[PDB]
Amino acid sequence: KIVSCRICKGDHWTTRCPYKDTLG
């Protein structure tokens, strides 16, 4: 449908986000 990140809301899911440092 529509791809939207959950960390920066760019152009890529939350998995392929260039800032998935939210792993901890």
Minimum separation from the CB atom of position 12 to Zn ion (A): 6
Residues 1-24 that bind Zn ion (CB under 5 A): 5, 7-8, 10, 17
Core vs surface per residue 5-24: b (16+ CB within 10 A) or e = beeeeeeeeeeebeeeeeee
SS3 state at 23:
helix
Q: Shortest approach of Zn ion to residue 20 CB, angstroms?
A: 8
2/5 with CB nearer Zn ion: 5
Residues that bind Zn ion (CB under 5 A): 5, 7-8, 10, 17
